[PDB]
Design a protein around this ligand. Structure first.
Ligand code: HEM
Ligand SMILES: [Mg+2]
Ligand SMILES: [Mg+2]
Ligand SMILES: [Mg+2]
Ligand SMILES: [Mg+2]
Length: 380
């Protein structure tokens, strides 16, 4: 009951089976393993995200370090909002260039054969990095992600993770010193116009981390749930203007980012239980997006739901909390919509009569960020 742990293999197997017992029965669940509380109720979670004075979180220029173990937001957001119209042909090519090898076979794994690389490549365009280097970059990003997400690492993984983030610095740092004097129109160049080299590397790195994982996760998650609800897929195929709805419901239904940490600046009460200073709470987004106080039939994937509030699903005043909520809302919400919309449409254009593979076994993994282990599809 309160004896159960949200860091367990058991929980990590299927977080969705325990959210309900978590609200209603132990909403502000203490995690003995750390000095961290886990908050499962929608309205609590949302109050926490709306009030980042009481519940602070790291700056964009703060080098990330393992989650388990304020004016630039706009400068990023806008110069990401100005970016997306420019990067749409490049996102489109990436999708086409990366699908290209797999057509003809009529067989792909949208996660491992395509997704990861696609997202990596879109971010590399956002940062103006040379897409020849996408193998190195992916491997490096992954090693770092591994260090941030993980509960624990072996000395090897940790030694690899250190290496990866060493390599990235060796790679990006010369690009930063270059663009300071010869800036293109890419994000790195823009950041050089009022922060230090190392500051900018941190921001760049946090934008590398932020903009990659969730985007490939969502693509795969949406396609999977559309295929798992095939008339909703047909709905989307016959009217492509539903893709924002399919995207939004996927985000509500299986948020790629499951946990949003916040540090407590003071003593304060969320719900009923009292929590002391400097302790860190964890917003359980999965649990909040499945809360029947916010959504009706919450455990039903329905792209046509009336309370989705599609009108706003890709903003800070949204109904689901997959981008967070309010002032500290995902900086690339507008970007994320476009990116996924584009690629989805191409995936759907090129993979005619797309379906799941014979004897494919769906499986999610992740505690802090969660998505499919793979998505084995077949098509003409
Ligand atoms: C599938 C779509 C995406 C989802 C669900 C998502 C989710 C999130 C969430 C939950 C946060 C936490 C905000 C908070 O602390 O309350 C966040 C932060 C952030 N997001 Fe996103 N994201 C997505 C795509 C993107 C993309 C494509 C970009 C960049 C274009 C982006 C840029 C950022 C940045 C820069 C942060 C700040 C984190 C930091 O301080 O390092 N996101 N995102
Ligand atoms: Mg080591
Ligand atoms: Mg389903
Ligand atoms: Mg159906
Ligand atoms: Mg499932």
């Amino acid at each position: 009951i309160k004896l159960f742990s949200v860091l367990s293999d058991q929980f990590q197997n299927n977080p969705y089976a325990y959210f309900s017992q978590l609200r209603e029965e132990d909403p502000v669940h203490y995690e003995e393993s750390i000095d961290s509380y886990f908050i499962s109720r929608y309205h609590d979670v949302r109050y926490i995200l709306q009030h980042p004075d009481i519940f602070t979180t790291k700056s964009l220029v703060e080098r990330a370090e393992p989650v388990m173990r304020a004016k630039r937001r706009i400068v990023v957001r806008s110069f990401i909002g100005d970016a997306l119209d420019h990067l749409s042909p490049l996102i489109k090519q990436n999708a086409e260039n990366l699908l290209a090898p797999y057509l003809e076979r009529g067989k792909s794994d949208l996660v491992n054969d395509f997704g990861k690389t696609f997202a990596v490549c879109v971010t590399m365009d956002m940062l103006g990095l040379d897409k020849r280097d996408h193998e190195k970059i992916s491997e490096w990003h992954s090693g770092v992600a591994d260090f941030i997400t993980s509960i624990s690492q072996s000395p090897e993984a940790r030694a690899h993770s250190l290496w990866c983030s060493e390599q990235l610095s060796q790679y990006l740092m010369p690009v930063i010193k270059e663009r300071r004097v010869n800036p293109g129109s890419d994000l790195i160049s823009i950041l050089c116009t009022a922060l230090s080299d190392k500051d900018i590397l941190a921001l760049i790195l946090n934008v590398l981390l932020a903009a990659t994982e969730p985007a490939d996760k969502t693509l795969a998650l949406m396609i999977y749930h559309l295929l798992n609800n095939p008339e909703q897929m047909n709905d989307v195929l016959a009217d492509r203007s539903l893709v924002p709805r399919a995207i939004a419901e996927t985000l509500r239904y299986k948020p790629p980012v499951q946990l949003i940490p916040r540090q407590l600046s003071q003593d304060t009460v969320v719900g009923g239980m009292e929590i002391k200073k400097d302790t860190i709470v964890f917003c359980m987004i999965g649990a909040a997006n499945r809360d029947p106080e916010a959504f009706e039939q919450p455990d039903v994937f329905n792209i046509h739901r009336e309370d989705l509030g599609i009108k706003s699903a890709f903003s800070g005043a949204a109904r689901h909390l997959a981008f967070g909520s309010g002032i500290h809302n995902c900086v690339g919400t507008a970007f994320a919509k476009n990116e996924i919309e584009i690629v989805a449409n191409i995936v759907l254009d090129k993979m005619r009569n797309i379906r799941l593979e014979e004897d494919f076994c769906y499986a999610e993994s992740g505690l802090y960020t969660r998505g499919p282990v793979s998505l084995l599809v077949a098509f003409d």
